[PDB]
Amino acid sequence: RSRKLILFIVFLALLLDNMLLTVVVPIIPSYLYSIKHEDLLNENVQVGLLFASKATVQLITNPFIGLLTNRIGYPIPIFAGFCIMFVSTIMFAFSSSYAFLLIARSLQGIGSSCSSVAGMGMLASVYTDDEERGNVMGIALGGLAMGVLVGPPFGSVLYEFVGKTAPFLVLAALVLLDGAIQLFVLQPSRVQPESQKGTPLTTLLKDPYILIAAGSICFANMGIAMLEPALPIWMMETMCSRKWQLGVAFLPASISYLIGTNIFGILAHKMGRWLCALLGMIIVGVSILCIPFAKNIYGLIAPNFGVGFAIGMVDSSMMPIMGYLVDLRHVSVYGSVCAIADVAFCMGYAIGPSAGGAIAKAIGFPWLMTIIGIIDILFAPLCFFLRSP
Ligand SMILES: COC(=O)[C@H]1[C@H]2C[C@@H]3c4[nH]c5cc(OC)ccc5c4CCN3C[C@H]2C[C@@H](OC(=O)c2cc(OC)c(OC)c(OC)c2)[C@@H]1OC
């Protein structure tokens, strides 16, 4: 009856959430191109809306699930989001209709948000010690980040080796194992009238100082959000990739993310968070500019590594400064940093792929990548105001 067990269930829950969020990336455009082979960019823009559907649904849903966890209890909605995730797995596996894909992703968003809120809530509640709670949240988020490293090569290899249905089924089997673990971990379900601070996050979002860092993360991951759906079609077109290099194309970004965060989480505190974020944004800009420069799959290993490393740079700079500013000049509560980070990520993935597809409909991929480079460069100086809050 170890608490580390519940840590394991929540860890694998959000890890599986990201893994399923990510393995869907290099396969759906293949579906759409294959179906349409037997309105050329309408499929691309509807892919962009498909990717943005989860972000929009989660953004709308998060207050509702927060209130629901406040009112009815902690154990019920995690299992509800579990069942939702299982339905999403089955719809990705067996269903092949585009509208079915939109419904599956939109449904998936609710369960993903519900897990990402309520599991963190239990992880904080059971872990009474504040420092212990903080470091366990850190390791849970580290697994959350490592899930998107696991995802893409797994999905691409199982897409090419077996077919269109095998890897979603493997993810579904992982879902069932997770649910068995969750059910066996906790036999009873309690109402859990946990007490929480009444100060909301709308005041935190209203502050420009937090908003600058939130926007920094927003565009920093809007780069990768816009990078997600365009690359597969960009490799089917004028690139003649052999239908499997998608996973090995996205892998360097993830591995660079993990190595950069792991090697700068101890250094950004020493050297300075504001200039660290400044350099991170500059590196995002230059790598994003250089992604069009590559003309072969071998070439893309460098700029993807750069953008992943720089996104890790920005995250390592900006994750602790949220809590620092919140403790300095706002309500001293835990979990609001996670809430503001989540709303920033949802914002970015809401307008990332949608605007990416909208631009790609009439403007080519090179100008898209360059222009988001200009937004990155232009946003870089605004981080200087964060040096002395
Ligand atoms: C898409 O999936 C995501 O959206 C997550 C990742 C996004 C993003 C990403 N996508 C990729 C897709 C690729 O091929 C398609 C290749 C590389 C990447 C990378 C590298 C960079 N990155 C990692 C991922 C980062 C995740 O978020 C957090 O790890 C996080 C961390 C925190 O502290 C560290 C938080 O605060 C305590 C927090 O609040 C909830 C969230 C993020 O949200 C869940």
PDB file of C-alpha atoms in Angstrom, residues 5-6 9 55 63-64 67 71 75 133 135 139 144 181 195 203 215 218 246 254 292 306 309 381:
ATOM      1  CA  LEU A   5       2.555   3.071  -6.071  1.00  0.00           C
ATOM      2  CA  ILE A   6       0.009   5.866  -6.602  1.00  0.00           C
ATOM      3  CA  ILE A   9      -0.062   5.111 -11.595  1.00  0.00           C
ATOM      4  CA  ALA A  55      -5.985  21.837 -27.081  1.00  0.00           C
ATOM      5  CA  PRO A  63     -12.200  24.835 -15.143  1.00  0.00           C
ATOM      6  CA  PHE A  64     -15.073  22.339 -15.276  1.00  0.00           C
ATOM      7  CA  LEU A  67     -14.745  22.376 -10.049  1.00  0.00           C
ATOM      8  CA  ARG A  71     -17.091  19.040  -5.486  1.00  0.00           C
ATOM      9  CA  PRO A  75     -10.881   9.118  -7.301  1.00  0.00           C
ATOM     10  CA  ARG A 133       5.585  17.008  -2.878  1.00  0.00           C
ATOM     11  CA  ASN A 135      10.269  16.852  -6.021  1.00  0.00           C
ATOM     12  CA  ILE A 139       9.702  13.516 -11.316  1.00  0.00           C
ATOM     13  CA  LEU A 144       5.508  13.430 -18.661  1.00  0.00           C
ATOM     14  CA  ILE A 181      -2.852  -1.073 -11.564  1.00  0.00           C
ATOM     15  CA  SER A 195      -9.199  22.252   1.622  1.00  0.00           C
ATOM     16  CA  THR A 203      -5.479  37.257 -10.929  1.00  0.00           C
ATOM     17  CA  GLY A 215       3.811  33.945 -23.626  1.00  0.00           C
ATOM     18  CA  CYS A 218       3.543  29.811 -25.534  1.00  0.00           C
ATOM     19  CA  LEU A 246       8.998  10.493 -39.365  1.00  0.00           C
ATOM     20  CA  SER A 254      12.855  14.986 -27.820  1.00  0.00           C
ATOM     21  CA  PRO A 292      13.948  24.962 -44.211  1.00  0.00           C
ATOM     22  CA  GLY A 306      18.575  22.757 -31.995  1.00  0.00           C
ATOM     23  CA  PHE A 309      17.476  21.896 -27.067  1.00  0.00           C
ATOM     24  CA  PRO A 381      13.830  41.175 -26.036  1.00  0.00           C
TER      25      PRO A 381
END
